[PDB]
Design a protein around this ligand. Structure first.
Ligand SMILES: Nc1ncnc2c1ncn2[C@@H]1O[C@H](COP(=O)(O)OP(=O)(O)O)[C@@H](O)[C@H]1O
Ligand SMILES: Nc1ncnc2c1ncn2[C@@H]1O[C@H](COP(=O)(O)OP(=O)(O)O)[C@@H](O)[C@H]1O
Ligand SMILES: Nc1ncnc2c1ncn2[C@@H]1O[C@H](COP(=O)(O)OP(=O)(O)O)[C@@H](O)[C@H]1O
Ligand SMILES: [Mg+2]
Ligand SMILES: [Mg+2]
Ligand SMILES: [Mg+2]
Ligand SMILES: [Mg+2]
Ligand SMILES: [Mg+2]
Lengths: 528, 98, 155, 526, 117, 532
């Protein structure tokens, strides 16, 4: 290569082409997969990441760990992207997708090094993934009875399986029942914003509770608030979006008077406007008043005089949850405060929870929202508990959409690997090697489970392969018993769509990585 | 054709085998290559496909013109021959419609 | 045991994966467990001298020179200027005990330090830390039930 | 604290880029001296790093002064040096041929052909090239002086010395013939050692001549020495004529009064005895490579003997060859055979502001001095280079009397023969074979380009002409740009020069094709 | 630090008549292959500003790790355009510099040759 | 806690770094394997250029920092020293073995089991090679040597000219042949003086039926051609005599200084007279000769060469029958030189080779000697020809010493892989994986050859493995053991019939050395790097 006084690209452009860059891309993918490798399974371990500001994030979630990793490698970013995709569409399996993709790339690396054309590998991956998805859909177990008790049990088992890998796995039955109960009360859309999650420092995990209603923190009470009663036995709730305090009528309003009588009339008119709003609220029959906009001290004292509870500056989502639980309507004008626009709950009370004051709306019979109040010894403890409960909630929602379950613990992947190997034994032979490599790479998850648990991976792998070969579909890794067992009878259940999405995303990532032959990096502009 | 990993000055990922996108996301400094790139972009604007054809044909034409100049032909003769051959190809093309 | 992993490829080409990977550090597995247990042990041993009627005070000086003499474990750990993450976790544990109860903010730190110190010698013998945590949870449940059993009521 | 396998300053590149870079380096090196070929070539000025100026059009002289960083260019420079050392001509031709073959090889490597196939095709092509060159050669009669002069003229017609063709041709032919030697059944020429070229700036180049003897820039030791001797008997020496310390430590101890004077007198007597031993042979001139004491000069003048001191060893060997003498280190062992008789005149004369010693009438001398007189030092350097080329060509013709048509006629003939041969290959390597065969047309092409005529029409006409039966001697007239039968233009080249050029170009192409990886930056690790 | 103490090694400090002295040094290197002439910029060494401004021509000679010659600012006592032979004579007057041609190369178990039965 | 002033790596990290370093060293030279391989250019920091295909030279010239890479480089150097061929295959095999063993270790297989499996696989591979894949060279004749030389010179700058270079190599090796005690024909390579000189083409390289010296006559007065040469080899300088350190000259009578000074040179004069009086014509000495002694040789019409290399002088003395004399001292305290210490040659000439001269001692008697003059386009080409020629000479020596050869082109590797993958099922439970990985690693050679040839490596190696499996299973298909790779056409081919051989010692030593290097690297699981 010559200096060539006039150059084609910008000076400093870096270009990598050929087999070596593909091998380097595969190695980078393996490096990324290693960073979340040990977080998989009930024996998985958490990872702690410190940012530049010094904040520490402790998480067992693969997607969160990958997000906190500041990857810059163009090929490595695909694994993070597919982890984000799996989190978005499913919510669980973010650790499995990266491992599967990296194992695919590792298995096909020797064939790449020996000059195999990438298109053949891509076609083999597409065929194998299609066959595996069809097999998963075919052998997935579903019950067409719509029995409430067994469907509830299926939801609870799926929640426990999705939860039995986190720091709350000791109380996995308790939190699983809480999560299933919370999800069942969502109405039709299962919107995540309808499940409030409040984290309160202090207290054990068993002290965490689910509220059949809405609960939120106290919001900067004004003077005279402590004179209000803090418990009602059948209150009517006025959900408002109104600023109840003395203020200018309008920002651009101007008052022009030339008589002291008019001055007194103006001040009395302002006071009368405020008192008329408060009087309308009072004769609306409501005992609890909530508002997005601030509620002034004058209004607070007025409500205290009438023995009512008031709370201004309530967050928008909390008022939405209160409206959907008590069954009222958020009002921007108080002129027509009819009976139907007033919320209603059986019991309202303010109670102290770990050094904080919380307002409780319990006893709602037709509530369509929830409120998780999580307790723990550190803010990261509550954060990880919230992440785990989010995973469980997503799993339960997906199970509600379609109750198609497959046994976990790597049993499904053993069945898929056996089926794929059997299929590959009946083709010419160029695709046979690649499909066999795909089937072998499908064994990564149970092997990783055994490695994390401290087992001997080879013996468990051999036993699982022998068990699946001669008959047996749901035989996977049993962590506690140091051996293998029928995971379906052990209630290690997984929605089939989770593994379907995992396989699809891993295959797409592997094909995209393999299809790239050259990498070009333009010099950075405005480095600052 | 294989996809290409392209990183622009803003560190934005690009995987594509589309010639026009690759050319757009390359900091091309040689002005003759700039003319080739803008001809490709004009082809993309007018039709929407065939940009890689434009680059390949232009490159082949330029290398063969360099060979012709080396063997002794003048630039004017090469240009005239290319124009005549392009006219002949345009005349021929309707007869090749299947 | 530090600076992540440095390969620079087997073909001599640059191998950059994580931004500023040369300026970052990483600890894996048992070494990280030992470091965390040591940090928690140091914090607990610092706190344990201020336990009981004969416990002595700690004289805390902030960044502005204001000095505070106190015996409250939560107050001591809150004003302590730590940088180890496990020390911050211990401080947050003491603050949580203060928020929920208001008393015993020093007992929690000492108990956690002792638990991790024993877990260190359990780990040295080849026991998975998850097994240690499960055993600790079972023993904690047993101890809580015993506390409920031997509890006494007052007017 | 980075961990590395190789050094942090070791850079590696491989693949198509390495081959393209090497071939482009060879092409650029060829382009450097592309216009310096043919009778109508132009001069080039080279600024030496030591402040000197080299003004020439020789390919090797131009390439030798160029400092390059790309190792392929270094390989090309070494190729030019090898061609210059082996035969003394064809440096520009071999460089251009190597560049053209490597361009063709790059064309073939752009496709999916492995370099080994191209190398095998190139080697088969080279074998056929050698066969055709040997086939189209013609013999040369050694005793025909006119034919030798014509050959030397065709060799030097492309240089700046072409303005004086007869003079340079006669000088080169006479020097080569008289330096030719035969002893013990072994024939040698030895242009490198004998036939020295001495250049004295000033005068006119028409006064330049080759002496029947030797000439050195030396003066008589004493003014009383004879500066003009008719028939001298030169005696050559290798040792000093002065008292010198012995090898062993030889401290003396003087206790008597007269021992000091006795020691000095014995030094005097030792010098006298050495001079008497020299004189006993009755010579006229004494030449030695080392110093001569003043007492030795006095004793030699007493016998009317001219003495010159401090001559170079090469000059003394040249004098020994010229005057038929033998260099003797110990004067006490001088023999009549060692005395050099055969020099017909010795004369010391003044040229400019210096004294020069002439021994210029030797009968049957085996060494000569070429006295170059010109405008300046650079002009004389160029004339010396041209004379070196002429003498090398004369030696090549004398060793091998085969002769080959020039002006691109041989190139086109070999190309046509190889193209006809390739019609029966019916393989995958026929394409590189035919292409490297046609690559020989660059020499007529660059001849036409330098002449300024129409390249395409002339090459097409020449190719059509070479397709006939008896047309192997049809080249291009480099000064008129017309097709002319070369057996009447008289431009012919020795077969050895063409063979060396072809072989060197083909092997340069092969060597640069054998390469696909480059590593650099590591210490030499002595 | 490296190389044998029995070989005289000199270094030159320069900034971008430096060219003439560099040419003379190249000529001496061609004339003295046993020596390892080399040069290095002052800015690389980061010497003092006075050396950079008034001591541009530096003739530093090392022999076994010690300075047997520290010729600095040789403009006055040597000149500006003197040739390589002048520098050689000047350096050899102080007894510092050291006092056939093959085809190309000859160099290539310890069993040299044995015809013993 | 450790408080060790240095960096520490433990577990998977250090193993991965070692494997990456070994793989990088392998990938450095993987492109110069087999006839379709291509050479590399090495450029120093001072501009020196080296072009070579030999793996050992490439690894020696490179700067290597990682200790495992150093291990591989020294492995290549040892393979070159002990065999002379296969310096690239050994490195590639060792790196592949290390990679597969590391993969097994990552599969939680203990490294001791992998090491035991590798040892068993190496032993069984050596046994199978020695029992099935060897070909006896007694019934093949000179064609076996020619084919071995041609195979060794493939992938080299002298590949296509093999038809001539193999003849040259075989002739030289057979010329330097000698027999020793207990009747073992020994071939002392490195006795063939390889002389380089650029100029005319490779086909003009000359094999000298004698010896060649890279030196000329001391004086221009001596004759440059002697027909009946009586070579006198000396190991002492011929110059003015000088007394030793313990002897000093002190003069008290001034009349004796002239006699002292005369005797000083007359001693050397009389030594030269004694040497010449026996009829010597060519005089070679390791020391120097001054002017007067050169004149003494000139007057007698005899050659005199100074500064002769000691090894060259020893070879000349052995070939011509002369004996080297470090001094002219007999067993009765006198100075003498008998005619018995004179070697003889058919002709001694100073030939001119490309504007330079060298001395050719032609057709020495009482012993046959050989030398090679290599002609190339430039210096780098000549150096590469010399390296390839040395490799070919070593291969021919190995073939002549041990009369067993094996088919080339990856046939041995494929047969070994099939046999080992079949044999691994017989012994052990965890070692079987190690033996299977050894068999898989042995397949890196044909894969690399196919990749270099830009052929379909997968299909070609699959066909080779199928052929060898059929050979091993069917007992009437033993003829398929020789099925190698035809790189020119990219098809399987009977390499034994095609004439592609190589010494069995090459494969055996490569396997043993690669296995030992992989075992050595595999034991490492912790690194401490103290700061300097
Ligand atoms: N009780 C169990 N026994 C064995 N394996 C389990 C059990 N519970 C979960 N798993 C396995 O753990 C894996 C999920 O691990 P986890 O890190 O929680 O989520 P992800 O799917 O994102 O890795 C599943 O593939 C499942 O097979
Ligand atoms: N009068 C002439 N007419 C045409 N061609 C000529 C004439 N004289 C010489 N040539 C050609 O020019 C070439 C000499 O070019 P020259 O400058 O000597 O190159 P180089 O220095 O490499 O030998 C020869 O090959 C010869 O055939
Ligand atoms: N003509 C040929 N056909 C097929 N294979 C060959 C041929 N010549 C050599 N080989 C194979 O190529 C391999 C590489 O040899 P090479 O790398 O040149 O030797 P080294 O390892 O000493 O450098 C050898 O193992 C040999 O079996
Ligand atoms: Mg999960
Ligand atoms: Mg298109
Ligand atoms: Mg207390
Ligand atoms: Mg010429
Ligand atoms: Mg070899």
């Amino acid at each position: 290569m010559m200096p060539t006084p006039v150059i084609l690209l910008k000076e400093g452009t870096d270009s990598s082409q050929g087999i070596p860059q593909l091998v380097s891309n595969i190695s980078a993918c393996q490096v990324i997969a290693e960073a979340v490798r040990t977080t998989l399974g009930p024996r998985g371990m958490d990872k702690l990441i410190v940012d530049g500001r010094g904040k520490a994030t402790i998480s067992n979630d693969g997607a969160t760990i990958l997000k906190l990793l500041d990857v810059v490698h163009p090929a490595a970013k695909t694994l993070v992207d597919i982890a984000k995709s799996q989190d978005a569409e499913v919510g669980d399996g973010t650790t499995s997708v990266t491992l599967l993709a990296a194992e695919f790339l590792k298995q096909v690396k020797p064939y790449v090094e020996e000059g195999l054309h990438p298109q053949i590998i891509i076609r083999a991956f597409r065929t194998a993934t299609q066959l595996a998805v069809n097999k998963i859909k075919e052998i997935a177990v579903t019950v067409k009875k719509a029995d409430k008790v067994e469907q509830r049990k299926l939801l609870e088992k799926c929640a426990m399986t999705a939860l039995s890998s986190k720091l709350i796995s000791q109380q996995k039955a308790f939190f699983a029942k809480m999560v299933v109960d919370a999800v069942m009360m969502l109405d039709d859309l299962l919107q995540l914003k309808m499940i409030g999650i409040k984290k309160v420092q202090g207290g054990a995990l068993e002290d965490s509770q689910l509220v059949a209603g809405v609960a939120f923190k106290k919001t900067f009470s004004y003077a005279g608030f402590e004179m209000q009663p803090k418990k009602y036995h059948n209150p009517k709730i006025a959900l408002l979006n109104v600023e109840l305090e003395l203020k200018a009528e309008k920002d651009n309003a101007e008052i022009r008077v030339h008589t002291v009588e008019d001055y007194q009339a103006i001040v009395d008119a302002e006071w009368n406007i405020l008192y008329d709003k408060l009087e309308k609220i009072h004769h609306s029959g409501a005992k609890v008043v909530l508002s997005k906009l601030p509620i002034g001290d004058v209004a607070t004292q007025y409500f205290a005089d009438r023995d009512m509870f008031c709370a201004g500056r309530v967050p928008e989502e909390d008022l939405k949850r209160t409206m959907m639980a008590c069954g009222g309507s958020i009002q921007t004008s108080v002129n027509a405060l009819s009976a139907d626009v007033l919320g209603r709950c059986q019991v309202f009370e303010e109670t102290q929870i770990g050094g904080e004051r919380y307002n409780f709306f319990t006893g709602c019979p037709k509530a369509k929202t929830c409120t998780f109040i999580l307790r723990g010894g550190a803010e990261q403890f509550m954060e990880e508990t919230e992440r785990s409960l989010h995973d469980a909630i997503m799993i339960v929602r997906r199970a509600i959409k379609n109750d198609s379950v497959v046994a976990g613990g790597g049993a499904i992947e053993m069945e898929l690997s056996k089926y794929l190997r059997d299929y590959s034994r009946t083709i010419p032979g160029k695709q046979q090697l690649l499909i066999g490599a795909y089937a072998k790479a499908l064994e990564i998850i149970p092997r990783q489970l055994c490695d994390n648990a401290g087992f001997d991976a080879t013996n468990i792998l051999n036993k699982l392969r022998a068990r699946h070969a001669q008959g047996g579909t749901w035989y996977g890794v049993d962590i506690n018993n140091e051996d293998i067992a029928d995971n379906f009878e052990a209630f290690v259940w997984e929605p089939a769509m989770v593994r379907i999405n995992a396989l699809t995303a891993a295959s797409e990532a592997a094909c995209l990585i393999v299809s790239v032959d050259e990498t070009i990096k333009n010099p950075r502009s405005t480095v600052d | 054709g294989m996809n290409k990993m392209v990183i622009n000055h803003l560190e934005k990922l690009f995987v594509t085998n589309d010639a026009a996108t690759i050319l757009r996301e390359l900091e091309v400094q040689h002005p003759a290559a700039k003319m080739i790139v803008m001809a490709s972009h004009m082809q993309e604007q007018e039709v929407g496909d065939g940009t890689n054809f434009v680059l390949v044909f232009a490159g082949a034409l330029l290398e063969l013109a360099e060979e012709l100049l080396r063997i002794g032909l003048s630039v004017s003769e090469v240009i005239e021959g290319y124009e005549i051959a392009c006219r002949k190809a345009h005349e021929i093309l309707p007869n090749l419609v299947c | 045991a530090s600076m992540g992993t440095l390969a620079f490829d087997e073909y001599g080409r640059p191998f950059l994966i994580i931004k500023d990977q040369d300026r970052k550090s990483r600890l894996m597995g048992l070494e990280a467990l030992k470091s965390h247990i040591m940090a928690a042990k140091a914090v607990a041993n610092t706190m344990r001298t201020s336990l009981g009627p004969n416990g002595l005070d700690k004289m805390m000086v902030d960044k502005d020179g204001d000095v505070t003499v106190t015996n409250d474990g939560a107050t001591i750990l809150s004003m302590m200027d730590v940088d180890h993450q496990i020390a911050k976790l211990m401080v947050e544990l003491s603050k949580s005990q203060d928020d929920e109860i208001g008393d015993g903010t020093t007992g929690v730190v000492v108990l956690a330090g002792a638990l991790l110190e024993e877990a260190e010698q359990l780990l040295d013998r080849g026991i998975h830390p998850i097994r240690i945590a499960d055993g600790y949870e079972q023993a904690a449940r047993v101890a809580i039930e015993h506390l409920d059993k031997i509890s006494d009521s007052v007017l | 604290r980075p961990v590395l396998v190789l050094s942090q300053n070791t850079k590696r590149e491989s693949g198509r880029k390495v081959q393209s870079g090497n071939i482009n380096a060879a092409k650029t090196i060829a382009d450097i001296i592309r216009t310096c070929l043919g009778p109508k070539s132009m001069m080039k000025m080279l600024l030496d790093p030591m402040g000197g100026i080299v003004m020439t059009n020789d390919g090797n002289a131009i390439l030798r002064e160029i400092q390059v960083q790309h190792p392929a260019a270094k390989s090309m420079i070494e190729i030019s040096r090898t061609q210059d050392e082996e035969v003394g001509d064809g440096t520009t031709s071999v460089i251009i041929l190597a560049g053209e073959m490597l361009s063709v090889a790059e064309h073939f490597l752009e496709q999916q052909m492995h370099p080994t196939v191209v190398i095998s095709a190139y080697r088969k092509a080279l074998d056929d090239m050698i066969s055709t060159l040997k086939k189209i050669s013609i013999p040369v009669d050694i005793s025909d002086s006119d034919m030798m002069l014509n050959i030397i003229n065709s060799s030097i017609t492309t240089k700046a010395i072409s303005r004086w063709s007869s003079l340079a041709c006669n000088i080169a032919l006479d020097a080569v013939k008289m330096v030719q030697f035969e002893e013990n059944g072994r024939k040698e020429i030895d242009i490198k050692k004998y036939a020295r070229v001495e250049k004295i700036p000033g005068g006119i180049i028409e006064d330049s001549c080759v002496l029947r003897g030797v000439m050195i820039n030396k003066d008589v030791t004493h003014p009383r020495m004879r500066r003009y001797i008719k028939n001298p008997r030169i005696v050559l020496l290798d040792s000093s004529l002065e008292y010198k310390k012995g090898e062993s430590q030889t401290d003396i101890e003087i206790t008597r009064e007269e021992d000091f004077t006795r020691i000095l007198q014995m030094e005097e007597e030792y010098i006298q005895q050495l001079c008497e031993d020299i004189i006993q042979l009755k010579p006229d001139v004494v030449i030695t490579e080392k110093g001569i004491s003043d007492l030795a000069q006095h004793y030699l003048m007493r016998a009317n003997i001219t003495a010159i001191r401090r001559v170079r060893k090469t000059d003394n060997n040249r004098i020994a060859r010229a005057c038929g003498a033998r260099i003797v280190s110990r004067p006490e062992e001088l023999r009549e055979d060692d005395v050099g008789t055969g020099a017909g005149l010795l004369e010391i004369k003044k040229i400019g502001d210096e004294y020069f010693t002439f021994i210029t009438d030797c009968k049957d001398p085996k060494a000569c001095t070429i006295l170059l007189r010109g405008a300046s030092k650079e002009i004389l350097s160029e004339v010396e280079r041209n004379l070196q080329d002429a003498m090398q060509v004369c030696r090549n013709v004398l060793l091998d009397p085969q002769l080959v048509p020039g002006g691109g006629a041989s190139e086109m003939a070999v190309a046509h023969a190889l193209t006809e041969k390739s019609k029966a290959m019916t393989g995958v390597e026929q394409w590189p074979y035919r292409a490297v065969a046609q690559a020989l047309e660059v020499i007529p092409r660059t001849l036409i380009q330098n002449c300024g005529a129409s390249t395409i029409r002339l090459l097409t006409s020449l190719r059509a002409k070479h397709t006939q039966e008896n047309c192997e001697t049809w080249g291009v007239n480099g000064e008129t740009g017309t097709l002319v039968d070369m057996k009447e233009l008289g431009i012919w080249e020795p077969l050895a020069v063409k063979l060396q050029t072809y072989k060197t170009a083909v092997e340069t192409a092969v060597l640069l094709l054998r390469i696909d990886d480059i590593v650099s930056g590591h210490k030499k690790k002595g | 630090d490296k190389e044998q103490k029995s070989i005289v090694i000199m270094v030159h400090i320069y900034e971008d008549g430096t060219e003439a002295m560099n040419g003379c040094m190249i000529c001496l290197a061609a004339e003295y292959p046993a020596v390892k002439f080399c040069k290095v910029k002052s800015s690389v060494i980061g010497a003092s500003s006075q050396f950079t401004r008034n001591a541009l021509p530096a003739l530093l000679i090392y022999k076994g790790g010690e300075l047997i010659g520290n010729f600095v600012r040789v403009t006055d006592q040597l000149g500006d355009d003197f040739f390589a032979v002048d520098l050689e004579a000047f350096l050899q007057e102080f007894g510092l510099l050291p006092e056939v041609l093959t085809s190309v190369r000859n160099s290539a178990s310890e069993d040299s040759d044995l015809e013993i039965d | 806690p450790l408080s060790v002033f240095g960096d520490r790596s433990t577990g998977e990290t250090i193993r991965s770094q070692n494997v990456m370093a070994a793989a990088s060293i392998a990938n450095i030279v993987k492109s110069s394997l087999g006839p379709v391989g291509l050479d590399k250019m090495l450029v120093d920091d001072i501009g020196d250029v080296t072009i070579t295909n030999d793996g050992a030279t490439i690894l020696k010239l490179l700067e290597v920092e990682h200790p495992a890479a150093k291990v591989l480089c020294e492995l290549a150097d040892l393979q070159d020293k002990e065999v002379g061929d296969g310096t690239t295959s050994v490195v590639i095999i060792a790196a592949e073995l290390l990679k597969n063993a590391d993969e097994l270790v990552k599969q939680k297989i203990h490294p001791t089991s992998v090491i035991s499996g590798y040892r068993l696989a190496c032993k069984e591979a050596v046994r199978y090679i020695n029992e099935n894949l060897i070909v006896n060279t007694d019934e093949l004749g000179r064609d076996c040597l020619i084919n071995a030389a041609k195979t060794s010179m493939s992938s080299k700058i002298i590949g296509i000219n093999g038809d001539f270079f193999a003849n040259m190599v075989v002739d030289a090796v057979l010329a330097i042949k000698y027999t020793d005690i207990r009747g073992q024909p020994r071939y002392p390579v490195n006795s063939v003086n390889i002389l380089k000189a650029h100029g005319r083409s490779q086909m003009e390289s000359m094999l000298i039926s004698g010896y060649a010296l890279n030196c000329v006559v001391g004086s221009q007065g001596m004759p440059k051609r002697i027909v009946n040469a009586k070579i006198a080899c000396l190991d002492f300088s011929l110059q003015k005599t000088k007394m030793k350190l313990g002897v000093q000259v002190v003069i008290t009578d001034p009349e004796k200084l002239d006699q002292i000074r005369q005797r000083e040179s007359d001693i050397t004069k009389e030594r030269i007279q004694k040497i010449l009086a026996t009829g010597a014509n060519v005089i070679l000495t390791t020391g120097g000769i001054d002017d007067m002694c050169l004149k003494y040789f000139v007057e007698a019409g005899a050659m005199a060469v100074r500064r002769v290399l000691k090894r060259d002088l020893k070879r000349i003395a052995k070939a011509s029958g002369a004996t080297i004399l470090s001094t002219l001292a007999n067993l009765e305290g006198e100075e003498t030189f008998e005619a018995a210490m004179l070697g003889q040659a058919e002709e001694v000439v100073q030939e001119r080779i490309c504007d330079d001269e060298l001395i050719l001692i032609k057709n020495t008697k009482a012993r046959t000697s050989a030398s090679i003059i290599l002609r190339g386009a430039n210096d780098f080409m000549c150096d590469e020809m010399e390296r390839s020629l040395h490799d070919a000479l070593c291969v021919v020596k190995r073939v002549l010493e041990s009369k067993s050869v094996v088919p080339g082109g990856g046939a041995v590797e494929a047969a070994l892989s099939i046999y080992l993958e079949n044999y691994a099922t017989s012994m052990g439970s965890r070692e079987q994986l190690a033996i299977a990985e050894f068999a898989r690693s042995l397949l890196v050679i044909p894969n690399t050859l196919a990749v270099n040839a830009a052929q379909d490596s997968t299909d070609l190696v699959a066909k080779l493995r199928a052929f060898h499996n059929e050979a091993q299973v069917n007992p009437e298909r033993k003829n398929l053991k020789w099925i190698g790779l035809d790189l020119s056409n990219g098809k399987p081919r009977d390499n034994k019939q095609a004439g592609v051989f190589e010494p069995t010692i090459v494969k055996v030593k490569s396997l043993k050395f690669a296995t030992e290097a992989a075992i050595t690297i595999l034991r490492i699981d912790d690194l401490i790097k103290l700061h300097p």
